[PDB]
């Protein structure tokens, strides 16, 4: 690139205008993007905005790891374990059994054990197009209760089949994250308590540190009135 | 640098699933010195990533952004630390203000006296902690210190 743009926020208004393009000229914006992208990169599904994005595990009806039947497509009536979701598109990438496309790929992105440039790759698919399985497929799932998961380490909801709430579709237990990194502090030290609220006389963090912690010349923090000030103000 | 590498590969980097930024609650029960050390470690990590990120963007013209994401995450932890530092000071100030109101302080002292002091079924240890907590008396001189001494004398007389 030879840019330097990344070390600053210059031409901010222009960037905002470009970034927040009007939605009725979104086809115009993306037409040229589509053209630019090669076949193996580009996706058919609409790149949804971060507002309308499934952040919660309730908003996603399915998690990476669970088993799902595909429908409304070429590879329909096919069971598939969903591998990973795409965040920008609001869609899932399924395993080998799911929907795919055969596309030419350059030798930069060649897998070990390839004869041809042609490679089959999995297309993204929406949560609307595929239904759960348990063999019995599920029409729709609803969430009514919640609980702390041991493996996920989150207060996740209970996936219950729509109609009869007692038939729980359980979450897929994820793979064990064997953490061995120098930049992650271990559980014992991460949580060990070294502070206690003890003193009322001595303040906990020093007076010379305050200017870093908060702006002493803050225009927002208005001063309170006094009697003398009132008297000065009023005729 | 990190392990004397011109650039951390994808394998050399810490993966996203294994890594988490600090929680504000977790930070809240850490000492000042510890928090300060953590902050400087974060800053060091950012510098390492910033060097690398710059190289990636300026020279090779990449859009891989793992380094950038890491830097952002570190920045998040830093502001959370900054927030908890401010919050602690504010809490202290509020406590001071509360103590300054005389009746409330008197009530608090009475409550302290009733439950744990002057009771049976340790006391000295409580007093030494209480001394430090409420007055300027460790093991230098002020009106507050004098008041604490008087209170201690009163407690001794009672007991």
């Amino acid at each position: 690139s030879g840019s330097y743009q990344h070390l600053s926020n210059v031409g901010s208004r222009v960037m905002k205008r470009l970034g927040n393009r009007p939605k009725n000229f979104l086809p115009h914006s993306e037409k040229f993007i589509k053209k630019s992208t090669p076949e193996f990169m580009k996706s058919d599904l609409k790149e949804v905005d971060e507002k309308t994005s499934f952040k919660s595990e309730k908003e996603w009806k399915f998690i990476p790891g669970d088993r799902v039947v595909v429908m409304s497509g070429a590879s329909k009536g096919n069971i598939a374990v969903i591998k990973s979701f795409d965040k920008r598109t609001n869609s899932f990438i399924l395993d080998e059994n799911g929907p795919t496309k055969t596309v030419p790929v350059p030798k930069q992105f060649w897998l070990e054990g390839q004869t041809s440039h042609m490679i089959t790759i999995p297309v993204s698919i929406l949560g609307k197009d595929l239904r759960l399985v348990a063999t019995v497929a599920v029409r729709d799932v609803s969430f009514n209760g919640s609980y702390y998961d041991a493996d996920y380490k989150k207060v996740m909801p209970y996936r219950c089949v729509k109609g009869q709430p007692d038939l729980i579709i359980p979450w897929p237990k994820p793979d064990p994250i064997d953490v061995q990194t120098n930049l992650a502090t271990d559980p014992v030290i991460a949580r060990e308590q070294t502070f206690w609220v003890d003193s009322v006389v001595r303040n906990p963090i020093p007076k010379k540190a305050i200017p870093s912690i908060r702006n002493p010349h803050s225009k927002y923090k208005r001063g309170t009135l006094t009697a003398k000030d009132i008297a000065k103000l009023v005729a | 640098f990190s392990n004397k590498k011109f650039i951390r590969s994808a394998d050399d980097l810490p993966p996203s699933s294994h890594i988490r930024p600090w929680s504000i609650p977790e930070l809240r029960h850490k000492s000042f010195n510890d928090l300060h050390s953590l902050w400087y470690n974060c800053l060091r990590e950012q510098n390492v990533l910033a060097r690398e990120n710059h190289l990636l963007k300026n020279i090779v013209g990449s859009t891989h952004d793992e380094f950038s994401e890491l830097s952002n995450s570190i920045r998040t932890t830093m502001w959370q630390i900054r927030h908890v530092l401010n919050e602690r000071e504010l809490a202290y100030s509020a406590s001071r203000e509360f103590l300054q109101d005389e009746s409330e302080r008197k009530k608090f002292l009475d409550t302290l006296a009733n439950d744990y002091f002057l009771n049976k079924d340790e006391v000295a240890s409580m007093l030494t902690r209480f001394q430090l907590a409420i007055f300027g008396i460790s093991e230098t001189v002020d009106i507050n210190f004098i008041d604490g001494i008087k209170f201690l004398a009163n407690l001794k007389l009672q007991r």
């Binding site: 990169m41 591998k83 795409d86 990438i93 790759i121 | 994808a10």
Partner: peptide, 15 residues
């Protein structure tokens, strides 16, 4: 999406 898939494939190959 493709890039992420490719990365996953590489990881699988490695392990």
């Amino acid at each position: 999406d493709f890039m992420s898939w490719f990365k996953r494939k590489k990881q699988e190959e490695h392990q």
